[PDB]
Design a protein around this ligand. Structure first.
Ligand code: CA
Ligand code: CA
Ligand code: CA
Ligand code: CA
Ligand code: CA
Ligand code: CA
Lengths: 153, 153, 153, 153, 153, 153
């Protein structure tokens, strides 16, 4: 047993390892979404840019948990990072609804294990409300305008 | 009777107290409107930002009247600030029409008791004309565009 | 039910609404105290200036709780803001003792629901100790000196 | 078939997808190495810092290939990223020998599909030569000195 | 009973007083270690410099708890600060192992009563691992090199 | 016997150790005084601030004597630091009279073993003369004014 380990249950150690894999999984799904909207096919580059730094944000959380695991004297055990659920993510509304479920699954896991997770979820809810207001799925002009006016900051 | 009080009728003193409560009431209604448009549900953040500084503007008028009351030797008597008329304010058009009535009620009271009240009312009339041009209530794309192009300055 | 709402009890939602009204109530009482010390009658302008930004501090807490309520997917329900307990607040000692009770009532509610509430309460206790040392209620020279040397920073 | 696709074989498209997964695999293995040397247990923080930006460098290559795939009109197909070979990487020499094999496997794949891959491999060969000169595996003072003088820049 | 005291158990008040004495005790032990390595006899001045600001860090924690005790309306009761366990602390490894036990005893007490205590303990574990790698107790060249390369920043 | 020890009597070595403990004792008593005047109860924050840097000044003297002991080849032997005489220090006059006795006891010991000790003692005599002029113990307004005008620089 580790010399810096003091009052850190084997259960917390195993839960942090599940959270690391979950965050890497979330990062991979956002990476997949980022390059889907960059397709010539799809071409909504500010939506793509949002999913790419969301991908980076989740990879950063995973590295911070790994840091925390070593700090407390736990041992990091890595698992395969499963391929994302879909290869195509439909339109901006569909993709944002899938991202909201993903952030709620990550947040659920953190509860079972924050001021930032709730910020992220409120942001995705705001986005979904505005995409429905602009008439998605059907209104392509609405989708173009969302990428320029909301995702272009 | 106050040592600085000179040519200030008991009627003007009571009217200034009614105006203080009216301005606090207007501030509370705008605060209510500000946080309604911030709902994940509604999410028109520049409309929300407009109602929040309108809320601050009315609270500032109330403090200036209280300042004026003491300056003239009157005595401030505060009353309960009634809860706003509605908890939900509908859409941007509905909310702007309710704000125009509120500014006209405040302005009516000031007449019975300015270069700024008329500016505020002309501004709300301009806003309502443009929301009707954009097709509110029905046109959600119009409402999104109003929040970006007019309320985003 | 709200799309961003995840693990937020109906009880926490109702308690946050009670806290919003309590903070607006505290803000109104401090506003009342601020303009009492500004009377020609009373004229302790640094005591007045302290109660006015205390009034602003409590209104800011109420807006932050409203922000938090929307973030979590709760719905803000506003109530009347009751008129302050008194129209006259006596002398600086009397007013500071009333402010200490008010901050303890707000802090009690937050317990039932901080690093800042305890700071505020220790500050009011310090003030009351020094007003008793200067001989309040009777010693008017003490009261004048407190407004200049402690409340003038 | 894609409107921007011109003279891009289905074979090149499938090979770029294998290379993306290989680069993500290399990134994950370096991440694993980075946090192994950060253990209280191991504690060679400049060796850890080297493997962490190597992890970032490989993730950047994978994103650039994905960019290239969309540019040419190919379609990105992601696969699971397999867990690294080991959970423990032994000492600095063992870890550097494992990194040299990994960079040679990546470089082999790129041949089958550069001025930077050969730079990286010559760098790892230089490191291994110096670790053998310092007496690794046995000489712990040598290993400490390598982390300070070579990996500390 | 104190006028600012609200929801602060007599048990928390007595525990904070035990923690103040414990932190002063830790400060005194580090002071003792600091001047041991400054002996002409021993002369590892960067190890000495580390223990002197560790001594200052623990004295600062004790003053912050005393601040917290008055803030909450508790009353500070001081006790004798016991002389450190040893007058001689052996070599750098022996001293670092004694410091790790001391930080774990302080951290245990804080549990019974943080993001900084775990940082401090991981740092001492890292140091001990590197001193064992350099061949302490026997290898004096290793000890000299540790003082220059790790403790010299 | 130490290799740098030349013409340093075993008597001077033992006296320097008594002086180190005496200075740590003086530091602890001033620390106790510093946090007494910070009580909500007492609240004379510039008197508190004076005793806190006096506490730091005595701890600095103790560290300088320890430095001198090693320089000359003596060996530092630490003793328990006794708890201060009182837990409550009364009023500012009482506390200043206790500080004057403490500085005279430290200065007596230094004689038996300066341009700074006499400065410190003349300063405390000046303070006591002015507190008696302001009517301490009875005159609380005098005590408040001393904290603002003399201790506020
Ligand atoms: Ca799979
Ligand atoms: Ca009502
Ligand atoms: Ca009422
Ligand atoms: Ca596998
Ligand atoms: Ca003892
Ligand atoms: Ca004793």
């Amino acid at each position: 047993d580790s010399q810096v380990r003091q009052n850190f249950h084997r259960d917390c150690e195993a839960a942090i390892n599940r959270m690391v894999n979950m965050e890497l999984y979330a990062s991979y799904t956002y990476l997949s979404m980022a390059f889907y909207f960059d397709r010539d096919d799809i071409a909504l580059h500010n939506v793509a840019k949002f999913f790419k730094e969301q991908s980076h944000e989740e990879r950063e959380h995973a590295e911070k948990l790994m840091k925390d695991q070593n700090k407390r004297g736990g041992r990091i055990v890595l698992q395969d990072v499963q391929k994302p659920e879909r290869d195509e993510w439909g339109n901006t509304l569909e993709a944002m609804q899938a991202a909201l479920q993903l952030e709620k699954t990550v947040n659920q896991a953190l509860l079972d294990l924050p001021e930032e997770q709730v910020k992220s979820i409120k942001q995705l809810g705001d986005y979904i409300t505005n995409l429905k207001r602009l008439g998605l799925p059907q209104n392509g002009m609405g989708e173009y305008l969302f990428d320029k006016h909301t995702m272009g900051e």
